[PDB]
């Protein structure tokens, strides 16, 4: 089967910003890595899949944004959509 | 790096390659992987924030699987996104 990527080092960096004194067990980190791999593959899936069904040559932030609101429930989407636009607003500027 | 310039811990370059894997003929704008990296960093921060609170509430200094469960199973939106 398919190989998952390892996001542990980046999950750990995020943990230190939200809980600097708190560690994480190996098994708990493995669960986080599977969550991150699962959401990456789901959002990236519909963005590639919206660009090919809407006759678009390029995957942009607006396929990610649409996919995020297709898959994420309620306030998670709005906040994720908030955080996504602010990131490209530092990036483009 | 492109990830610092977006204010992110998650690697933008890796998300770019992940997006290109879905269709090697589909091109990837610069905004797409930055936006997606920030979305996953937010979701990661949200789970760890709540799981870290569960660890602290139980007088623990590290997150264990039970803390992830307590955090997600008691959050309707996370439990229904992650299962």
């Amino acid at each position: 089967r398919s190989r998952k990527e390892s996001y542990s080092i980046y999950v750990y960096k995020v943990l230190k910003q939200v809980h600097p004194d708190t560690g994480i067990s190996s098994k708990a980190m493995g669960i986080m890595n599977s969550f991150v791999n699962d959401i990456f593959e789901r959002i990236a899936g519909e963005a590639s899949r919206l660009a090919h069904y809407n006759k678009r040559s390029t995957i942009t932030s607006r396929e990610i944004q649409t996919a995020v609101r297709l898959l994420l429930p309620g306030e998670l989407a709005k906040h994720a959509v908030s955080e996504g636009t602010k990131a490209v607003t530092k990036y483009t500027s | 790096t492109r990830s610092s310039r977006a204010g992110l811990q998650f690697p933008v370059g890796r998300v770019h390659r992940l997006l290109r894997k879905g269709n090697y003929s589909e091109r990837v704008g610069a905004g797409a992987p930055v936006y997606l990296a920030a979305v996953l960093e937010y979701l990661t921060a949200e789970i760890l924030e709540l799981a870290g609170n569960a660890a602290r509430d139980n007088k623990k200094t590290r997150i264990i699987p039970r803390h992830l469960q307590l955090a997600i199973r008691n959050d309707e939106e996370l439990n229904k996104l992650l299962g």
Binding site: I9, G23, I24, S25, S26, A28, M29 | -
Partner: peptide, 18 residues
């Protein structure tokens, strides 16, 4: 028997960056 097929915390080592 929790030690036979349950979660044992003392066997779940800390995740280590370095």
């Amino acid at each position: 028997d929790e030690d036979e097929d349950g979660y044992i915390e003392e066997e779940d080592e800390d995740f280590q960056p370095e």
